[PDB]
Structure formats: C-alpha cells, structure tokens
Design a protein around this ligand. Sequence first.
Ligand code: CA
Ligand code: CA
Ligand code: CA
Ligand code: CA
Ligand code: CA
Ligand code: CA
Ligand code: CA
Ligand code: CA
Ligand code: CA
Ligand code: CA
Ligand code: CA
Ligand code: CA
Ligand code: CA
Ligand code: CA
Ligand code: CA
Ligand code: CL
Lengths: 318, 318, 318
Amino acid sequence: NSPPSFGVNMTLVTLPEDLPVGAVAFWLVATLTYGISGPNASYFSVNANTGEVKLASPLDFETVPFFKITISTSDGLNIRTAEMQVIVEDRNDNIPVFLNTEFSTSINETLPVGSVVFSVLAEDKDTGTAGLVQYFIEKVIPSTANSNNLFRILENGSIVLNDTLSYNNKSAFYQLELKACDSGGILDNKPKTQCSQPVFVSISVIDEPDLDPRFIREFYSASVAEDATLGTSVLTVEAVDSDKGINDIVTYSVSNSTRPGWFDIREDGVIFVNGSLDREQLLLENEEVQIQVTATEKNLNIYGQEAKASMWVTIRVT
Amino acid sequence: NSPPSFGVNMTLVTLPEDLPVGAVAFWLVATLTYGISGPNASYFSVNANTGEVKLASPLDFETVPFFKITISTSDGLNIRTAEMQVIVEDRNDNIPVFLNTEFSTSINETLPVGSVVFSVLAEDKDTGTAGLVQYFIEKVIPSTANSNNLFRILENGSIVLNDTLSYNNKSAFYQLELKACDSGGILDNKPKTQCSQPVFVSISVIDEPDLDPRFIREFYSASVAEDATLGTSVLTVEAVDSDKGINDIVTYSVSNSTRPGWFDIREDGVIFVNGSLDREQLLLENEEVQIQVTATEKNLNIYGQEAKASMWVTIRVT
Amino acid sequence: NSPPSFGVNMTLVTLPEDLPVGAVAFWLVATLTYGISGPNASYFSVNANTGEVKLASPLDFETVPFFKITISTSDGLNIRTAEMQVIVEDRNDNIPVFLNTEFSTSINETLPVGSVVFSVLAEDKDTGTAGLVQYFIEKVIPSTANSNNLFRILENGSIVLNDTLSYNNKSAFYQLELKACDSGGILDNKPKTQCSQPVFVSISVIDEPDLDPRFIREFYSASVAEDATLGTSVLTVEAVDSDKGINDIVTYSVSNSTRPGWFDIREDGVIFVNGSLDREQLLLENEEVQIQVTATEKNLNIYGQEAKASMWVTIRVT
Ligand SMILES: [Ca+2]
Ligand SMILES: [Ca+2]
Ligand SMILES: [Ca+2]
Ligand SMILES: [Ca+2]
Ligand SMILES: [Ca+2]
Ligand SMILES: [Ca+2]
Ligand SMILES: [Ca+2]
Ligand SMILES: [Ca+2]
Ligand SMILES: [Ca+2]
Ligand SMILES: [Ca+2]
Ligand SMILES: [Ca+2]
Ligand SMILES: [Ca+2]
Ligand SMILES: [Ca+2]
Ligand SMILES: [Ca+2]
Ligand SMILES: [Ca+2]
Ligand SMILES: [Cl-]
C-alpha cells in the first residue's frame, strides 16, 4: 500500500522506428536547462527549459539499430553530462521484394508429380516474423478446376507440380500469378502484414511423343478394275500424329488381308495394285477385298516403342 | 561512478496483455492526490493518496492493442493533467483453431506420389511466432510401418502422398489424426507453445482396374465320353477379378489345345463338346486332351489394355 | 509544452540476457544508502552510496527467464524495502543442433519423385524466430547439373526426391552436406542469425532390375564343316545384364533361323550342331546359315516381365 522509496533509471531509452518526426520521444527531468550533444544530436530537438524532447530526424532500424547520445544539464555554474543509449526497435515497414516481376520457363509434359517446376525468391528487410517470407499462388490462367490443382508452392518459393501435364489434352501454356507476404509484425502499434507486388510465371509445356497416330476417317473404301496393271493407284489413306506439338511423319504397311499380295501401300499412304487381280475368285466374297493398313510414326515414343494404329479398308474389284 | 543528473519520462506505458486484474500495473509519483479519467478510466483503479495503480479490467491485445488515459494530480488548488498512452503487448494466449474436427475425402489408388491428398487450415489469433501455425500428423490408422510412411504434412496444411496406395494390398481406408501448434511465444513471462484440439481426416481409397483376374483352382480336369453330342457340358472353370473393389465380369475363350475344335467355352466358364470326339486317336496321348483357357475382364485396365490370365485344363475322353 | 506533473514507476525491470557482467544494469534513485538482498542478490552488485547497480552474474533466458529481488533504502534510522521483478529478455545466443554429424541411408533407384529420402532434425533452444529452424542443402557430391536438381529439403527437415535416380546411368552414391539456421533475432542490439555445424547424409542407391541384357559384340560369325557331328561346338556368344549392381545370370535360346533345327544353343551361350548339315543345300544362300539368338535374364524385371535381347549370327558351312 505504501509506495517504493526509490525509482529506477535505466542507462538506455527504447524507441520504435515508426516514431514520427516531431512526436515527443520523451521528457528529461531532474533529480535548470537541458541539452543533447555529440555526433547523433540531430536525431533530437530539446526544449532547454522544459525538458521536452522531440524526435528531429527519422529512425530506421534497418540502417541504425542503436546509437548513443550525450545529455547535459546546467545550473548556470556547472554542466553535468551523461551518455544514454537509444535502442531502435524494429517495426514491419518493409515489403517482400523479388528482383523481376515476370519469369518464364519450359517443362516437359512427362515431368513427374512432386517435381519442382520453378523457384522464386523474395526478400524482406525486416527482422523476425516481419521479415519471414511466405509465398502464394494467386491465379492460374487458363482457370479450370484442373489448372488450379496443377501447381502448388512451398514456403522456400519452389513451385511444385501436383498433377500430370498434357500439351494436347490440358494446355500447352500456363501463367501463374504469385505474391509474397511476410508473416506479420507491428506497425503503428497494431498488427501489420506486408505483401509484394504481383509477379508472374509463364510456363511452356513441351509436347513429348506419347500419343499414337490416328486415321483421318473411320471408313475408307474404293474400287479398282480387275485388269488394272501392276502399280495402279487405288486410294490414299492418311493417319496423323496425335502429338500436335510434334507432328512426326507417318509411314504405312499392309499388315493383313484377304488375298495376300494383291495390294500394297507406299510411305505416303497410297494403296496400289501389287499383283494380278481376279474378279471371279471374289464372287463368294462380294467382289471385295478387305485390307488391314498399319500406320507407324517414324520415331519411337518416349518408352522406346513404336507408335502405331491400324484399320481395315474395303476395295471393290470392278 | 557519479549518478546521472536527470531521469527520463516516456509518454507511454507498456503492459503485457496477461497482466492479471488486481495486480499493480504501476505507481504514479511526482515531480498531493492522483486520478485517472477519460473514456478508458475503467481499465485502472488508482489509490488517490499513494499513487498505486492496479489493473481493473482485463487487457487484450487481440481487441484493444493500445489506448489513451488521462492522469491527473491535484494540490487542492489546481488540477494538472497529462495524457499517457498504454501499449498492450501481445502474449501467446490463443490456440490454433480449425472450423471442423472431422474431414473426409476419396482418392484414386493410382494417385501419384507427391500429390496433395487433402488440405486443412488452422488459424491462431496471436501475432508473430505465437500466431504462426505448424501442422503435425499424430497417428495413422491402421498403424503399420507402411501406413506411417504413406502421408506427410506441409507447413501450409497440405497432406501429401509419400508412397503408393493399394486398395487390395494395403488398405481401402485410412484415418489420420492431426494437430496444429503455434511456433511459440511467451505467457506469464516464460516460453509457451499452444496446440489445437485433435482433428481427424478419413481417407477412402478407390479401387482402380490394374490387377489381372485369377483362376479359382490351380488344377482343373474332367471326363467326357467319346460319343458325347455337340454341346455337352464337360466342366466349369472360374476366374475372378483381383480388384475386389471392382469385381468386373470375366469372359473366357479357348486360346489353344491339342485337338483344335474338339472343345470350346462360354462366357460363363462352361466348357463344352464342340466337335466329334475320338478316344482311339488319343491312345498315344493318354486318352487325354489338354486345353488352354484364357479369362479376360470385360473392361480394359487403367493402361487401356486387356486384363487376362490363362491356364491349361486336362480332359479325359471316356 | 509544460512537463507532466508525475512520473511512473513500474514494479519490474527488463534486461536483455546478453547484458555483460559488469555493465551497469541500472541506477537506484529516491524519491541515504541502497542495497539488494534476498536469494537472487548475487545477480547484482550495488554501490551503496551512489545507487549504481552492475550486473554481477550472467543472465540466461534459457534457464532463468524472470526472478525477484529485494531492494532496500536506509536513512540510518529505518530500512524500507520493496520487491522488484526482473524480466530477462530472450536474445539469439543459441545455435541449431543435430544429435549426430553424419547419417546414412539406402534407397531403391525406382523411388518415386516426391518421396521422402531421409529426415533430419535440428533444435535451437531460443524462443521465437530465434528458435525457428530452417534447413539447407549446401552441397551434393558428385556435383553435376543433374545431382544438384536431384534432392530438395523442406522446412521440417525432410529431404525429398526431386528427379529420378539411376544406379547405372547417374550414380550409385551421393553425399549431401546440410546446415540448419534459425530465422534470426537480435544479439547485442542488432540482427543475428545462427547456423549449425555442417552435417552429412550419405545415400546409397540400390540397383533394381530394369535394364535389359546386352550382347558383347555387334557381330558374331563362325565356321563349321558340313560333316560335323551332333553336338559339335561352333562358337560362344555372350550377353550380360546391364544392371551392374545385379549381374543376373543370362540364358540363351535360338529364336529363329534359316534352316530350323540345324543349330541350337546352351545356357552358357555355346552354339552347337543340332542336326545333319548340308553344304550343297546352301549353294543359293552363300554357303551360310543365319541364326537369331535371344538372351533372357533368369529373373523377371521390376514390371514382372522377361528382360531379353536378340541378335543374328552368321555361320559358314565348311
Ligand atoms: Ca525502417
Ligand atoms: Ca516486412
Ligand atoms: Ca523494419
Ligand atoms: Ca504428347
Ligand atoms: Ca505420337
Ligand atoms: Ca488476448
Ligand atoms: Ca497462439
Ligand atoms: Ca495474444
Ligand atoms: Ca486395383
Ligand atoms: Ca482387374
Ligand atoms: Ca542464453
Ligand atoms: Ca537461435
Ligand atoms: Ca536465448
Ligand atoms: Ca537398374
Ligand atoms: Ca537386367
Ligand atoms: Cl513436397
């Protein structure tokens, strides 16, 4: 109930770095006129009579975290001085910054899930959680349920692939918008989190050979006279590479038929007379030959195998 | 050695938010009777004679981070007042909270490793590391060396798949227990970390068609008389889909034999007489026919191919 | 402009834990001689006349975060005492520590991307960001563009596989050097981040059977006289397992030829006369037999299939 018989004077004074110029930092009281001197005198403006001390130049933890001042009191006769230390406290006045605002990269569509796609780095000059950077994916373009599941970002700024890519069935391109925030702190005596400007990552997906070729038509038939000579054109078939970022050349072969030898095919899909034809032998089978054509890409697929497709063609003898 | 000739009076007072009601917050001293007035007067109780100031209502950084008070001194004749600011300091008095305590989801058993399975979010109202949420997987049920390797959790609350699933060979279901803690702070002047209540994630694994069918028996044989007519039942074989979450229908065909044509098989696994049989032709081969039966699932597997199995069957002619 | 008519005396004093022994902690002033007493008296050394109080024993937040002292003033006649609390503030004076400096583990080369390879844990005794551990991969040996893309580390200390392994085509071994730092704090009034001693993780990659066997030579031919008897050696071919961590045994079979039956091959690669040979029948085909040899590993590959390779061999009859 009875008050302490002493007070306590620290050798230091602690100011927050967001203390505005012209605010009162503190009052000097005795225990006459007061002053502040020495190389850091210009941080303060002292009222010599009242002891009122205002901040006269901005504080900044990032450059001058602490400094000394000399305080003086005078009774007219003698000036007594003491040194005082100023601790400047950090506040969340810096943002996370990246060195560029746009990035680009290419990735293979077979990139495995859990692979790092690209890494960004933002730095924030504050200390503590005010300096501790987190990353966020804000938007993915094109925006589909699937594009928003495709990529994810880690605390270190690495973007990881989270689902499988497809140049031909999903998208050849993505643009990700990101930001970086700090993990919060204080500014003007209340919570404050700072965020970066938006940044963009352009991703090109590279088409790899893993889709088989497809014939242009579900049906092909044609007719040929029974006396047609060796090498007569009958018809052209076409199959094309489903990997549209590749469009590998296709070749063809006759893999099977009713009447082996009667027809063959060139690399360019043209089916020709390759033997003596005979309308009379086909009177049982509707005067018709059925022929299986196989289309094969020139290069092997990603698994080191042939990329092929096949189908049957009907040909009318006369 | 000689003491400073001044003291220093700040314009503010800093209290921790866990200061208990009724504790002494501070003493007012001159430089008579003291008072506290203005809209925030009820935070304090002042002893007018001694200057003792107790906290009279709870402090709470989360709602009132700072506020002003008016302090007054009186000598009987005149009342002098000054404003004083109260900075309330954050302490770790909040826990990480999730919006529900149980979650459920389904995933395909072919989900690739490094995929996100499910994401939870906990929030903690404190600021700084006291507010910074970390996640933990506490338990996995069923508990095996393998179930505890299967899933892992990231700092953002995403549960990532770390090993491969199997509906049929591992488990159709998992239940994960999690918690969220903050990254520590101070409460009553010592370190304090806060944790959430337990939360649970129920995972259903979806069976996908990637296991071939299996015959019920390692051996099948039967007997048939040599004069048995076209279509006589001989025996039933059975193969079933190993994907037990699917149980796809199976069909059968005779893929090979000694004596092509003598036997065939129906979709329901029944092997029948499909030709004239002749005991005398088999006197060299133990009066026996061997037959290869192939079972094929009706739907294609995940890789777009036939799910098949085969075996040989012995049949005794008379 | 006119100074406040009171000062404010807190019941506590706050010191940073890096306050050096022998520095002035504070001055006691009245409101005669001063003293400090009670069980924690030895933390301070008081000048009884001047009120100068120096720190007399090291402060340490990690063991004694706060403690009480009794301060006394005497006028000769009576001694008045009050208790004062000392709050010790945490500073970043501890480093992240791991329990060992070297670790080792083995992983299968088919380990999927996004799998955890190994986990380390460092702990740092400080509180707040000064206690919050981050991990870094400093070096990978051997150092190639590819080895530095292979592994990545998460905030929880798990090393994740980021690209595909190969015992035979990349490396059977890696050594990773890591460190752990805290997330910064203050020491002697300025920012300070602490780092661990280096730690090493030795990774053995286990060779799995997923590469086919390869013949030693691109060409083999030999000669045999036309009257050579049943079982005469002609030549030895050799194929070996490309999985050099395995070196599975290989067997051979003749998969095809011009003149079926004339030659066969043993498990040890030796090709022998297996029929009556006849130089005269081969006068059209350059007195030569061409033979396809297939080499097959004894064990199935990781996908449950045969690991095979084939080639043609020419054999001169006389
Ligand atoms: Ca600043
Ligand atoms: Ca910041
Ligand atoms: Ca700052
Ligand atoms: Ca492709
Ligand atoms: Ca293709
Ligand atoms: Ca609170
Ligand atoms: Ca908290
Ligand atoms: Ca709080
Ligand atoms: Ca399955
Ligand atoms: Ca199946
Ligand atoms: Ca310490
Ligand atoms: Ca530390
Ligand atoms: Ca410490
Ligand atoms: Ca291998
Ligand atoms: Ca092999
Ligand atoms: Cl990850």
